[PDB]
């Protein structure tokens, strides 16, 4: 079971220092900071990472949420990326949850982080190029050295 401990304002960047944002269509994408849309994208670059105490310690249990008009929370349900219409909860009774990811650092690189679905072992948040776009996806990943599943997290609380 999980219990929420603290929430932190966060900016998430991929392997190429592109910044995660939510577009008009509620799609999680990555922007180059010289992109012409970076001005309009800027409010949608802010994520809330909430840390959870875990009765079955496997990694740092977190939810990732966005604050638009209302709060929505990132989900790995059905092995894809979506946003559940829900604030991060105070308590979660189960040991696995579609909104809980295990955040862990990369061996030798304490600042590089990987987020594993707690529902689907071996599935990770990843950056993927798809035509002209860079998309946040849920990727079945056998190779933990794959830099496309590595992110940095910058605190904006201060």
Swiss-Prot record:
Mutagenesis or variant effect for residue 104 to A: Reduces binding to IL18R1 and the ability to induce IFNG production
Impact after mutating residue 84 to A: Reduces binding of the preformed binary complex of IL18 and IL18R1 to IL18RAP resulting in impaired IFNG production
Reported impact of residue 8 to A: Reduces binding to IL18R1 and the ability to induce IFNG production
Residues flagged as site, Cleavage: 35-36
A biological-process GO annotation: positive regulation of smooth muscle cell proliferation
Gene induction: In macrophages, release is increased by endocannabinoid anandamide/AEA.
GO CC annotation: cytosol; extracellular region; extracellular space
Keywords tagged on the record: Cytokine, Cytoplasm, Inflammatory response, Secreted
Effect of residue 110 to A: Reduces binding of the preformed binary complex of IL18 and IL18R1 to IL18RAP
UniProt modification remark: The pro-IL-18 precursor is processed by CASP1, CASP4 or CASP5 to yield its mature, active form. The pro-IL-18 precursor features autoinhibitory interactions between the propeptide and the post-cleavage-site region, preventing recognition by the IL18R1 receptor. Processing by CASP1, CASP4 or CASP5 induces conformational changes to generate critical receptor-binding sites. The mature form is then secreted and released in the extracellular milieu by passing through the gasdermin-D (GSDMD) pore. In contrast, cleavage by CASP3 inactivates IL18.
Outcome of swapping residue 79 to A: Reduces binding of the preformed binary complex of IL18 and IL18R1 to IL18RAP resulting in impaired IFNG production
UniProt-reported outcome of changing residue 112 to A: Abolishes binding of the preformed binary complex of IL18 and IL18R1 to IL18RAP
Recorded GO MF terms: cytokine activity; interleukin-18 receptor binding
Superkingdom, natural source: Eukaryota
Subcellular location: Cytoplasm, Cytosol; Secreted
Transmembrane regions listed in the UniProt entry: none
Binding partners and assembly: Forms a ternary complex with ligand-binding receptor subunit IL18R1 and signaling receptor subunit IL18RAP at the plasma membrane. Mature IL18 first binds to IL18R1 forming a low affinity binary complex, which then interacts with IL18RAP to form a high affinity ternary complex that signals inside the cell. Interacts with cargo receptor TMED10; the interaction mediates the translocation from the cytoplasm into the ERGIC (endoplasmic reticulum-Golgi intermediate compartment) and thereby secretion.
UniProt similarity note: Belongs to the IL-1 family.
Protein name from the UniProt record: Interleukin-18
Gene source species: Homo sapiens
Lineage: Eukaryota, Metazoa, Chordata, Craniata, Vertebrata
Gene: IL18
Portion of the full sequence shown: 37 to 193 of 193
């Amino acid at each position: 079971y999980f219990g929420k401990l603290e929430s932190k304002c966060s900016v998430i960047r991929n392997l190429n220092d592109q910044v995660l944002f939510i577009d008009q269509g509620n799609r999680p994408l990555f922007e180059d900071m010289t992109d012409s849309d970076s001005r309009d994208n800027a409010p949608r670059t802010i994520f809330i990472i909430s840390m959870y105490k875990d009765s079955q310690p496997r990694g740092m249990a977190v939810t990732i949420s966005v604050k638009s008009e209302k709060i929505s929370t990132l989900s790995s349900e059905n092995k894809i990326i979506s946003f559940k219409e829900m604030n991060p909860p105070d308590n979660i009774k189960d040991t696995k949850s579609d909104i809980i990811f295990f955040q862990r650092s990369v061996p030798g690189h304490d600042n590089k982080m990987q987020f594993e679905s707690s529902s689907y072992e071996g599935y990770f948040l990843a950056s993927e190029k798809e035509r002209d776009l860079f998309k946040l996806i849920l990727k079945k990943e056998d190779e933990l050295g794959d830099r496309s599943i590595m992110f940095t997290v910058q605190n904006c609380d201060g």
